[PDB]
Structure 1
């Protein structure tokens, strides 16, 4: 059993968006399906449920009339149509399967109409999720500043240097070093969302202290959402 979400993206409030969920590894036509969402650093929020044959639909009060669930059993696909999007709709969206099977009575297994599953009232399969971001912020490439190595950043034989990737929108940015030739001692930190609505993050690399001034170090920042790429050379300080 497998669930794969898609259709997520970054939009301004009032915009529309259509989420899709590809299901495999089981009889999609017989099982109920849920949409569940989780905002960044927040709790799970049940969004909607749809019966195996789509004859019944249920939506949360907070999304009713704006988000709507649907399904196509001929293509084994679950849909979530998102209209009049609001900032609070910003979250990771999960396609989730309703656990189910036959009900048991008088020594008999009963199924619903057309042998559809009865709900067992718990979720047994989750997709990895698709990201939805609703923001008034406009697209913006990152400003890349050097985080130069000095005596106050070295640890004996090794030294730390990096790049500050500042004020971009939206996520994500990816960072490599020396065009991927430098993969050891490298660590890129998760981004912070500043009150400006713009993001910032840092990428750091640990290198031989003796190699400074002889070896060149360039951070390759990539921001596809703005079609921007920046190669930043990091010069060593004399401190």
Structure 2
């Protein structure tokens, strides 16, 4: 019956602002302490701020003191995290979480319910669609009677990109790798598939690359030497 729903995450440049929201149902904010904990891409968990809505008390991690402000509105059963002067190193999934109040425990214990998280990306990078290049099946890079081919989805921003093959008809043996952030601020990633070498003449292989933030759709056909 308990739900926490975060909203307000998005893309913004350094020095900008965002206001997160944490809508709670199934329990009352005045019977809890509310927290924001962030998870940077690939990294662990790190606490940001906490608030006791019953009393007004708040606390902050030393790295957001004076930039972020946690607040709660009991008339909306919601908590908020105003984020000013965002830097790149604030990029993360931001979760809110409740600690339940127990009038016998004499202090706040673990974080016993977490929301789904909202993504905050802080970057100077410009929104841009990908360039798709074929990863050509080789005449000298067969594995068995099995060949690998693919397509490189390069220099796009922000995440995410969707890739399918032959309009979704080809799914078996597909690996679409996690994107990597290059030093230029743009993402790149490859999707690959293994295929019978004997099918290299008769079957046509086309990767369908879609990037919503840029309305960019590419269909790239990959062919041998």
TM score, norm. by length of structure 2: 0.91
Residue aligning to 1:157: 145
CA distance in structure 1 between the aligned counterparts of 2:30 and 2:219, rounded to whole angstroms: 50
Q: How does 1:1-239 map to 2 (within 5 A)?
A: 1-53=2-54, 55-103=56-104, 119-237=107-225
How far off is 1:218 after superposition? 0.9
CA distance in 1, matches of 2:6, 2:20: 7
CA deviation after TM superposition for structure 1 residue 40, in Å: 2.1
* Worse-superposed segment, 215-224 or 123-132: 123-132
Partner-residue secondary structure (3-state), 1:211 = helix
Following the alignment from structure 1 to structure 2, what is the Cα–Cα distance between the partners of residues 53 and 102?
Answer: 13
**Structure 2: distance between partners of 1:54 and 1:235:** 66
How far off its partner does 1:192 sit?
Answer: 1.0
Secondary structure class of the residue paired with 2:30: helix
CA contact (8 A) 2:30 2:52 kept: no
Cα pair 1:54 1:70 within 8 Å, conserved: no
Give 1:126 shift: 1.6
- The equivalent residue for 1:111 is none
Contact kept in structure 1, 2:93 and 2:117, CA below 8 Å: yes
Q: Distance in 2 between matches of 1:190 and 1:143?
A: 17
Structure 1, unaligned runs of 5 or more: 105-117
Consecutive unaligned residues of structure 2, counting only runs of 5 or more, are none
Task: Answer yes or no: is the 8 Å Cα contact 1:54–1:71 preserved in 2.
Answer: no
| Larger CA Rg, structure 1 vs 2 | 1
Deviation at residue 54 of structure 1 after TM alignment? 5.7
3-state SS of paired residue (1:155): coil
TM-score, with length taken from structure 1: 0.86
Kept in 1: contact 2:92–2:121 (CA 8 A): yes
Distance in 1 separating the partners of 2:9 and 2:217: 23
Q: Residues 18-70 of structure 1, C-alpha deviation per residue, up to 9 Å, x if partnerless? A: 11222233333311100111222334221111113362222222112221112
Tell me how large the CA RMSD over aligned residues is: 1.8
